[PDB]
């Protein structure tokens, strides 16, 4: 039934973290 | 104290996460009677399910 892979493992949360940027 | 003497193992794997999710894989299918040179109509495959405890 359905599948074998848990949903959250079908998503790769990127290791690169993007900091918020503000005016110069 | 009687719990841990009952035999229930203590599992220190959950880390610091707010919930632990366990997943179970079941083999579903069946072997079918075959001849020397035929096409098998029985297939072994996998299915799964999950549970979560906070």
């Amino acid at each position: 039934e359905g599948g074998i892979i848990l949903a959250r493992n079908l998503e790769h949360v990127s290791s690169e973290i993007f900091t918020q940027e503000f005016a110069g | 104290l009687t719990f841990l003497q009952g035999g229930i193992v203590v599992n220190n794997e959950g880390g610091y996460a707010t919930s632990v999710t366990k997943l179970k894989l079941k083999a579903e299918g069946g072997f079918r009677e075959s001849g020397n040179d035929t096409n098998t109509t029985g297939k072994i495959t996998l299915s799964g399910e999950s549970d979560s405890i906070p």
């Binding site: 949360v13 290791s15 973290i17 503000f22 | 880390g15 610091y16 996460a17 707010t18």
Partner: protein, 54 residues
């Protein structure tokens, strides 16, 4: 000469929950403190200090 002082606090719980995302929450607060100091130094030389009451 006037002084500006700002705090930042966390807990071991949220420290480790942030480490779950490979985020160093203490280091991230230190970077944020340095960045806000730079931004305030930039703003004080352009718009000066606005008092908290407007």
């Amino acid at each position: 000469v006037f002084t500006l002082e700002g705090e930042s606090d966390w807990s071991e719980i949220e420290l480790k929950q942030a480490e779950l995302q490979n985020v160093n929450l203490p280091s991230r607060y230190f970077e944020a403190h340095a960045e806000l100091y730079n931004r305030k130094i930039d703003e004080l030389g352009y718009l000066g200090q606005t008092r908290t009451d407007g």
